[PDB]
Design a binder for these strands. Structure first.
Ligand SMILES: O=c1ccn([C@H]2C[C@H](O)[C@@H](COP(=O)(O)NP(=O)(O)OP(=O)(O)O)O2)c(=O)[nH]1
Ligand SMILES: [Cl-]
Ligand SMILES: [Cl-]
Ligand SMILES: [Cl-]
Ligand SMILES: [Cl-]
Ligand SMILES: [Cl-]
Ligand SMILES: [Mg+2]
Ligand SMILES: [Mg+2]
Ligand code: NA
Ligand code: NA
Length: 326
DNA sequence: CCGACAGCGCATCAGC
DNA sequence: GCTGATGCGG
DNA sequence: GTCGG
């Protein structure tokens, strides 16, 4: 974190374009610049120095010079003062409320935590739970708690069927000392790219986890993806653990590597890798890596038997999960 | 300049 | 009821 | 907002 001041600035600028301006490309431009600068092993001394890095252009370089000289950015100082922008940025922090709903509520005058609570009636199910656990979802999860959660998930899944294989991905698999949430990749021999010999595969698991009171709420749920809430059990007289966000993805067993690659992230890593893939003439999703014909249309899935095989197709040396945190 | 910028599952809605 | 588009995950 | 062709 040699350039934390600069990266935080780029991140605030990113959120602004995302939440207020609804300009996703500017959002990603800022995030890319922040990321590349985050792994830069030197304390940046000038906008020009930073401009040498890919993803950092003239505009961002000018802002870096402003930030390095004054220790702040006028554009942000003004944005921070703007009531609408402020309110819109804040509301988007509730899970379920994005830029559109945020601006929408702000129009109606609903712009504070208090306002949301006195208007639950104006929230869909997901946004309702997000408000309920607003404080909790703001908290980080120490890796030690992730370990306890991992144990519960793997053992409970094993109890449903010994053939299930639950792998904890996301930032956890990347070695992080704390996570924003828990992401679980699920596989079972009965569900392959070729067939679904068994129904309720994901349901059974969700059900069992709810049975033992690990999963407390549901944000969204389908046959292959579950997005909800969970909580570690506390001992007698012991304060309860904060509620945690949990995501579970059931992927075809034979497409495991593409699935684990995707779910391990990071999101920026995935976007960079998938983009590189396109330039190399391939397309990558959580199921497969396919070549791109002359027309540009995806071809048939190429054989994959490891994460490395995917890296090899696009001519990228293998990168351990811990080195994919972009 | 100008087009590209990753990919997709679930919830919700408009139009039929 | 469906399909298609959009918001959200994030 | 940044980049490549
Ligand atoms: O936009 C996205 C979001 C997530 N993902 C993938 C990569 C990411 O590592 C994984 C889990 O998503 P999270 O939003 O949970 N992110 P991550 O676990 O990396 O970080 P955090 O610690 O915040 O949960 O899903 C994408 O491909 N694109
Ligand atoms: Cl944009
Ligand atoms: Cl994105
Ligand atoms: Cl600032
Ligand atoms: Cl695979
Ligand atoms: Cl596919
Ligand atoms: Mg995560
Ligand atoms: Mg997640
Ligand atoms: Na640059
Ligand atoms: Na939100």
């Amino acid at each position: 974190t040699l350039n934390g001041g600069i990266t935080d600035m780029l991140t605030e600028l990113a959120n602004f374009e995302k939440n207020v301006s609804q300009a996703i490309h500017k959002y990603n431009a800022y995030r890319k610049a922040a990321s590349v600068i985050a792994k830069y092993p030197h304390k940046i001394k000038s906008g020009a120095e930073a401009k040498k890095l890919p993803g950092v252009g003239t505009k961002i370089a000018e802002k870096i010079d402003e930030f390095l000289a004054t220790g702040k950015l006028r554009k942000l100082e003004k944005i921070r003062q703007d009531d609408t922008s402020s309110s819109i940025n804040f509301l988007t922090r509730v899970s379920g409320i994005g830029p559109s709903a945020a601006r929408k509520f702000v129009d109606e005058g609903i712009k504070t935590l208090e306002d949301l609570r006195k208007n639950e009636d104006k929230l869909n199910h997901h946004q309702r739970i997000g408000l309920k656990y607003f404080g909790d979802f703001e908290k980080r999860i120490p890796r030690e708690e992730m370990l306890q959660m991992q144990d519960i998930v793997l053992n409970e899944v094993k109890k449903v069927d010994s053939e299930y294989i639950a792998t904890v991905c996301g930032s956890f698999r990347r070695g992080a000392e704390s996570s924003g949430d828990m992401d679980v990749l699920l596989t079972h021999p009965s569900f392959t790219s070729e067939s679904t010999k068994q129904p309720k595969l994901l349901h059974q698991v969700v059900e069992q986890l709810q049975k033992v009171h690990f999963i407390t709420d549901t944000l969204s749920k389908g046959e292959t993806k579950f997005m909800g809430v969970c909580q570690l059990p506390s001992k007698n007289d012991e304060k309860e653990y904060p509620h945690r966000r949990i995501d579970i993805r059931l992927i075809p067993k034979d497409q495991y590597y593409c699935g684990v690659l995707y779910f391990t992230g990071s999101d920026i890593f995935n976007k960079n890798m998938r983009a590189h893939a396109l330039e190399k003439g391939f397309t990558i999703n959580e199921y497969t890596i396919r070549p791109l014909g002359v027309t540009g249309v995806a071809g048939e899935p190429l054989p994959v038997d490891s994460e490395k095989d995917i890296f090899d197709y696009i001519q990228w040396k293998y990168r351990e999960p811990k080195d994919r945190s972009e």
